[PDB]
Enzyme design. Structure first.
Site, PDB file in Angstrom:
ATOM      1  N   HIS A 132      47.416  52.431  40.477  1.00  9.43           N
ATOM      2  CA  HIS A 132      46.639  52.045  39.875  1.00  9.43           C
ATOM      3  C   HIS A 132      45.362  52.591  40.143  1.00  9.43           C
ATOM      4  O   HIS A 132      45.047  52.491  41.421  1.00  9.43           O
ATOM      5  CB  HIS A 132      45.899  50.916  38.819  1.00  9.43           C
ATOM      6  N   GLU A 148      44.499  49.170  48.127  1.00  6.34           N
ATOM      7  CA  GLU A 148      44.658  47.796  48.214  1.00  6.34           C
ATOM      8  C   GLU A 148      45.731  47.365  48.729  1.00  6.34           C
ATOM      9  O   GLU A 148      45.097  46.075  49.664  1.00  6.34           O
ATOM     10  CB  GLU A 148      43.274  47.761  47.982  1.00  6.34           C
ATOM     11  N   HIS A 188      46.784  41.391  41.047  1.00  9.50           N
ATOM     12  CA  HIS A 188      45.607  40.465  40.674  1.00  9.50           C
ATOM     13  C   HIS A 188      44.612  40.989  40.266  1.00  9.50           C
ATOM     14  O   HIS A 188      43.221  40.918  39.328  1.00  9.50           O
ATOM     15  CB  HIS A 188      44.686  40.263  42.579  1.00  9.50           C
ATOM     16  N   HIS A 246      35.071  41.678  43.861  1.00 10.85           N
ATOM     17  CA  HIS A 246      35.370  43.290  42.930  1.00 10.85           C
ATOM     18  C   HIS A 246      33.340  43.323  42.993  1.00 10.85           C
ATOM     19  O   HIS A 246      32.881  43.279  42.313  1.00 10.85           O
ATOM     20  CB  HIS A 246      36.492  43.280  42.212  1.00 10.85           C
TER      21      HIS A 246
HETATM   22  O1  LIG Z   1      42.213  46.772  34.254  1.00  9.92           O
HETATM   23  C1  LIG Z   1      42.915  46.717  35.053  1.00  9.92           C
HETATM   24  O2  LIG Z   1      44.014  46.566  35.193  1.00  9.92           O
HETATM   25  C2  LIG Z   1      42.044  46.104  36.458  1.00  9.92           C
HETATM   26  C3  LIG Z   1      40.865  45.985  36.297  1.00  9.92           C
HETATM   27  C4  LIG Z   1      40.624  45.019  38.049  1.00  9.92           C
HETATM   28  O3  LIG Z   1      39.026  44.843  38.197  1.00  9.92           O
HETATM   29  C5  LIG Z   1      41.296  44.943  39.091  1.00  9.92           C
HETATM   30  O4  LIG Z   1      40.931  44.798  40.577  1.00  9.92           O
HETATM   31  C6  LIG Z   1      42.189  45.268  38.407  1.00  9.92           C
HETATM   32  O5  LIG Z   1      43.510  45.287  40.138  1.00  9.92           O
HETATM   33  C7  LIG Z   1      43.259  46.178  37.708  1.00  9.92           C
HETATM   34 FE   LIG Z   2      41.460  44.534  43.982  1.00 14.35          FE
END
Ligand SMILES: O=C(O)c1cc(O)c(O)c(O)c1
Ligand SMILES: [Fe+3]
Ligand SMILES: [Fe+3]
Lengths: 405, 407
Positions: A191, A238, A11, A58
């Site tokens: 990530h 998450e 997401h 978030h």
């Molecule tokens: O910069 C990102 O790719 C990114 C940013 C977010 O706020 C997020 O929740 C995520 O799953 C990825």
């Molecule tokens: Fe998230």
């Protein structure tokens, strides 16, 4: 009553942002979009009535008060403002009835929940939804959002997300209504978006986690936050929400699709799961479950002068309870009295709701679905001493009612 | 680390709203036979179990909302900001209790900076000398008893069962009191509004103290019928009893039913432990730390735990309001006027003013507040990432498979 299957999808706001910029045609983003195409399609054919939608907010709608399992029970949801304005998307309908049913079975199974309405959905929800469902004015389906508190530790255990998914299946299944329900687990995959370690990914772990999720999910249930964030990045942990959606499905599933792309910070991944029914007829019956679920309000109907504040009532009464709750603010209780028909005019209360308040209609509002502690606010704010209310409830007036001691 | 024992006490709002008389005089000092015990024992902290009455918890409403912050002001209930002094909380203890609870598979909520309504303050200014501050610190467990489904009585009990040994394992040898605020039999809604019942109240008080496990089957119906609908909140009392010994000593017991609510009171004194617990206090502490054990071996990574949220709260709260177009417009236009009005310390201002990304993460800001701040300023996520890595944006974009930008 009919779980058709489930899908998993990242997401990342990058999804939302590539969509709005219409980079559908762009060389980087183009193949990432055809990654969604099987799930998009499968959703348009199966046409589920509702998607039970697992995501995390978030620190937008959830910050100063922050719960682990927050079931959205309201009838409608708009895009949050994340500091740039709401995205251009139509609100998406909820399903208070199903939410109520699920709420009940889940408490029966000793899961401590939270209920919420009125509040926006941030990229956690509308980022991959804007891309999986057509929305050029109406979303094809309803949603029951479960937002998960996965950012502020301690959060629930991996095994606890799994077990939530398990009870969740049988609640959804036992819903005595002939509907198709899809289940979504969103977030991930690898990530990390904070600190010097920002940038971290791990494609090896991402592919291992997905095949295990699909073909041996009980194998993941021992994973600690430390495990998951060492292999997956801090915010990658998450993916326990993926465990929850997976727990809501048949033990075996048909993995119809899997895709993976890693252009920037986020491993953008997608799985589709076809549900395969129940092999053996389950240990509790559909009807026994429905029994044990409202066992706590069994017989409650035969106590008159009693209007229990359940979720249906709370949803019915949400607008007026929210308006009357705004009395705790200074410039609202002050124009509640200086300018009622100005505070009324700018409101979104129905005319019936205005007049119920207007009439100082105490047991009328209780009947309607106003909770008393909102009245307890209204009476004190309008100066009306609380036991004027208790009297008007019973028919009597202040002095005749007073007789009991 | 040791619980001195619990007190049950109604949190009726008219105990305070007016009071601060021949009829109240008997209950009034039916209150001090637990007040004594609060003054002579002097608990360092009181784990306070109440319920918000749709003041602070409403649009988003939870079953066990643990207060994790440092100070609590009285909540403006419509009748204005009641003049009482900000009572202190106990984040360190709140943190630790959360970990034991989540390990025992109780799903929680955490909150900070919101007022406590009469449910806490009304009977507090009555059990505790609140002259210039309060004798003890507080850990407020706000329960969600008003909007069904709500947790079973069994569930309330077991929480308290876990709560107890969560407090016993707190490595600091301090003393903790346990408030089971709530009740008793009443009904303040419908035209049953005025229902009372004391052949139940008395049997409930007596069985709570000496055979509490006989209350672990009461449905809401059985409860609301015997005590009124709002009376059914006394499962909170069961939670409090949960946290005490299987055998106790009824040091006191008040009662007298004026207007609406059966105003009761039950001083407990914790005895010892039945038999030595099945899990050791070291073994508990380990199991509560297991989820995040070794997380310090991960580099460039600052877990957003409860202590971090409390540390970062003002600046996190301040950055959060960027989601409002009015705030975030002042933020861009006249930032210093926002700064001056804020409650941000001088370094918190500078972090934000200097666009010090890495510093804000070190300090306690959670990323998603920065993500907003970037958008408000029309710069993006990538810049923030690059800034974390101490690389220029093109040198950081090089570390990615492709080069995209977004907000
Ligand atoms: O910069 C990102 O790719 C990114 C940013 C977010 O706020 C997020 O929740 C995520 O799953 C990825
Ligand atoms: Fe998230
Ligand atoms: Fe109450």
């Amino acid at each position: 009553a009919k779980i058709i299957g489930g899908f998993a999808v990242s997401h990342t706001p990058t999804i939302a942002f590539a969509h709005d910029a219409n980079k559908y045609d762009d060389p980087v983003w183009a193949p990432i979009f055809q990654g969604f195409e099987p799930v998009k399609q499968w959703l348009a054919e199966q046409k589920p009535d509702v998607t039970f939608y697992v995501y995390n907010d978030h620190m937008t709608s959830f910050f100063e008060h922050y719960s682990h399992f927050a079931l959205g029970v309201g009838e409608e949801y708009s895009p949050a403002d994340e500091g740039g304005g709401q995205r251009d998307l139509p609100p998406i309908k909820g399903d208070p009835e199903l939410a109520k049913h699920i709420a009940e079975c889940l408490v029966a199974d000793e899961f401590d929940l939270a209920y919420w309405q009125g509040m926006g959905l941030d990229h956690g929800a509308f980022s991959p939804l804007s891309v999986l469902l057509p929305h050029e004015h109406g979303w094809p389906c309803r949603i029951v959002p479960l937002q998960c508190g996965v950012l502020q530790h301690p959060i629930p255990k991996a095994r606890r997300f799994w077990n939530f998914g398990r009870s969740l299946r049988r609640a959804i299944q036992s819903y005595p209504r002939d509907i198709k329900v899809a289940i979504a687990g969103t977030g991930g995959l690898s990530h990390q978006v904070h600190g010097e370690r920002a940038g971290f990914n791990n494609t090896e772990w991402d592919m291992e986690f997905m095949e295990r999720l699909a073909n041996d999910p009980e194998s993941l249930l021992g994973a600690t936050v430390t495990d998951l964030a060492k292999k997956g990045g801090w915010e990658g942990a998450e993916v326990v929400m993926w465990l929850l959606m997976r727990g809501a499905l048949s033990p075996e599933v048909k993995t119809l699709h899997q895709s993976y792309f890693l252009p920037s910070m986020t491993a953008i991944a997608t799985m589709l799961f076809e549900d395969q029914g129940d092999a053996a007829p389950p240990a509790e019956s559909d009807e026994a479950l429905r029994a044990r679920a409202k066992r706590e309000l069994a017989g409650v109907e035969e106590i008159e002068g009693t209007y229990p504040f359940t979720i249906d009532r709370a949803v019915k009464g949400f607008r007026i309870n929210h308006f009357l709750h705004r009395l705790i603010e200074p410039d609202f209780r002050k124009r509640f009295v200086e300018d009622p028909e100005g505070l009324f005019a700018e409101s979104d209360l129905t005319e019936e709701e205005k007049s119920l308040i207007r009439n100082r209609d105490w047991i009328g509002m209780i009947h309607y679905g106003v909770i008393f502690f909102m009245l307890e606010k209204m009476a004190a704010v309008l100066g009306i001493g609380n036991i004027d209310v208790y009297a008007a409830f019973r028919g009597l007036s202040v002095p005749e009612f007073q007789k009991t001691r």
